[PDB]
Design an enzyme around this catalytic site. Structure first.
Site, short mmCIF file in Angstrom:
data_model
loop_
_atom_site.label_atom_id
_atom_site.label_comp_id
_atom_site.label_asym_id
_atom_site.label_seq_id
_atom_site.Cartn_x
_atom_site.Cartn_y
_atom_site.Cartn_z
N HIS A 52 2.27 -39.64 78.04
CA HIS A 52 2.54 -38.72 76.94
C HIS A 52 4.03 -38.33 76.89
O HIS A 52 4.40 -37.52 76.05
CB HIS A 52 1.68 -37.46 77.08
CG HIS A 52 1.96 -36.54 78.26
ND1 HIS A 52 1.37 -36.54 79.45
CD2 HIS A 52 2.82 -35.46 78.22
CE1 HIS A 52 1.82 -35.51 80.13
NE2 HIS A 52 2.68 -34.89 79.37
N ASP A 78 -2.85 -41.74 81.92
CA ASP A 78 -1.56 -41.19 81.49
C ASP A 78 -0.44 -41.71 82.43
O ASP A 78 -0.06 -41.10 83.42
CB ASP A 78 -1.66 -39.70 81.55
CG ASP A 78 -0.51 -38.98 80.87
OD1 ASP A 78 0.23 -39.55 80.08
OD2 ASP A 78 -0.39 -37.80 81.05
N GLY A 81 7.46 -29.24 80.82
CA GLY A 81 8.76 -29.84 81.15
C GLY A 81 8.67 -30.58 82.52
O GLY A 81 9.58 -31.33 82.92
N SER A 109 6.03 -32.60 83.25
CA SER A 109 5.29 -33.83 82.97
C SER A 109 5.99 -35.09 83.32
O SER A 109 7.16 -35.22 83.02
CB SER A 109 4.96 -33.96 81.50
OG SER A 109 3.92 -33.04 81.15
N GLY A 110 5.29 -36.05 83.91
CA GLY A 110 5.90 -37.29 84.23
C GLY A 110 6.46 -37.26 85.63
O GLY A 110 6.64 -38.32 86.22
B1 LIG Z 1 3.83 -31.74 80.22
O1 LIG Z 1 3.71 -32.39 79.01
O2 LIG Z 1 5.54 -31.45 79.98
C1 LIG Z 1 6.48 -31.89 79.00
C2 LIG Z 1 6.20 -31.06 77.75
C3 LIG Z 1 7.50 -30.82 76.96
O3 LIG Z 1 8.27 -31.98 76.67
C4 LIG Z 1 2.79 -30.61 80.63
C5 LIG Z 1 2.43 -30.44 82.10
C6 LIG Z 1 1.59 -29.20 82.21
C7 LIG Z 1 0.99 -29.12 83.57
C8 LIG Z 1 0.28 -27.78 83.68
N1 LIG Z 1 -0.22 -27.66 85.04
N2 LIG Z 1 1.57 -31.15 80.05
C9 LIG Z 1 1.11 -30.76 78.85
O4 LIG Z 1 1.66 -29.83 78.23
C10 LIG Z 1 -0.14 -31.43 78.26
N3 LIG Z 1 -0.93 -30.35 77.67
C11 LIG Z 1 -1.47 -29.35 78.34
O5 LIG Z 1 -1.47 -29.24 79.59
C12 LIG Z 1 -2.08 -28.38 77.33
C13 LIG Z 1 -1.17 -27.15 77.19
N4 LIG Z 1 -3.40 -27.95 77.69
C14 LIG Z 1 -4.49 -28.68 77.43
O6 LIG Z 1 -4.42 -29.82 76.94
O7 LIG Z 1 -5.72 -28.12 77.76
C15 LIG Z 1 -6.41 -27.03 77.13
C16 LIG Z 1 -5.67 -25.66 77.19
C17 LIG Z 1 -7.79 -26.86 77.80
C18 LIG Z 1 -6.61 -27.37 75.63
C19 LIG Z 1 0.05 -32.39 77.04
C20 LIG Z 1 1.46 -32.37 76.47
C21 LIG Z 1 -0.32 -33.77 77.49
#
Ligand SMILES: *[B@]([O])(O[C][C][C][O])[C]([C][C][C][C][N+])[N]C(=O)[C]([N]C(=O)[C]([C])[N]C(=O)OC([C])([C])[C])[C]([C])[C]
Ligand SMILES: [Ca+2]
Length: 223
Positions: free
Chosen positions: A40, A84, A175, A177-178
């Site tokens: 992602h 992912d 931020g 992620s990855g």
């Molecule tokens: B990750 O994407 O960071 C980069 C984002 C900005 O460029 C982030 C890591 C979060 C880890 C938390 N321990 N991942 C995401 O934001 C992913 N989405 C989620 O975690 C979202 C907020 N939550 C979610 O999907 O679950 C529910 C709340 C149950 C709906 C997404 C970007 C793959």
């Protein structure tokens, strides 16, 4: 990283920052030409920034290398976040030394309770946003598959594991992620998703890299 500590400059030498005019995702260097991150995090115009600590100041040891191709896993599902993972090939090899080094791929999966290091430049606040300048670090255990599945019923595939703290307060966050999850000197996870950050009973979920080692190896060898 919410609840973590300043790593210390270049103490996490495999960590990269993927950048497109700003830091958007973390990544792990696994040899001189290849970075592993999360699918992602895919976009075009990616610059891999290696040897970083303050991402806003050039301090020395930085290598900025353009991504030559990003390879999102063929079965990546953006609605489940199953599979992912993505490989980024660098336009030229990085120069490896003590401040920029590759992390090893696992030969086996890690057991519940293994202590790992998660690192990145993402949000440090659970309620609201505060981006750090320098790399932050967290030590967090791998949770058992039952507590992970009891927290996210129905959403955990066999390519995922939870790590963190059920009492809340410490976690990866937006931020991050990855970025890497390293347990005994091997890359075991990739930061992927969770419900918010550092909430009670909602740990972070991580791509389980031991399931993808033959895929990584075969994709790198053919490209
Ligand atoms: B990750 O994407 O960071 C980069 C984002 C900005 O460029 C982030 C890591 C979060 C880890 C938390 N321990 N991942 C995401 O934001 C992913 N989405 C989620 O975690 C979202 C907020 N939550 C979610 O999907 O679950 C529910 C709340 C149950 C709906 C997404 C970007 C793959
Ligand atoms: Ca810098």
């Amino acid at each position: 990283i919410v609840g973590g500590y300043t790593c210390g400059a270049n103490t996490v030498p495999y960590q990269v920052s993927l950048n497109s005019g700003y830091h958007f995702c973390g990544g792990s260097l696994i040899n001189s030409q290849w970075v592993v991150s999360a699918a992602h995090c895919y976009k075009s115009g990616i610059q891999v920034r290696l040897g970083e600590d303050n991402i806003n100041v050039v301090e020395g040891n930085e290598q900025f290398i353009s991504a030559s191709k990003s390879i999102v896993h063929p079965s990546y599902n953006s609605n489940t976040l199953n599979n992912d993972i993505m490989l980024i090939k660098l336009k030229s090899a990085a120069s490896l030394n003590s401040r920029v080094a590759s992390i090893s791929l696992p030969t086996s999966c890690a057991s519940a309770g293994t202590q790992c290091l998660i690192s990145g430049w993402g949000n440090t606040k659970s309620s609201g946003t505060s981006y750090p300048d320098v790399l932050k670090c967290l030590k967090a255990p791998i949770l058992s598959d039952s507590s992970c599945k009891s927290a996210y019923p129905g959403q955990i595939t066999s390519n995922m594991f939870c790590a963190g703290y059920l009492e809340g307060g410490k976690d990866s966050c937006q931020g991050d992620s990855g970025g890497p999850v390293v347990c005994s000197g091997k890359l075991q996870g990739i930061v992927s998703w969770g419900s918010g950050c550092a909430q009670k009973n909602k740990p972070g979920v991580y791509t389980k890299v031991c399931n993808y080692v033959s895929w990584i190896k075969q994709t790198i060898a053919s490209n």
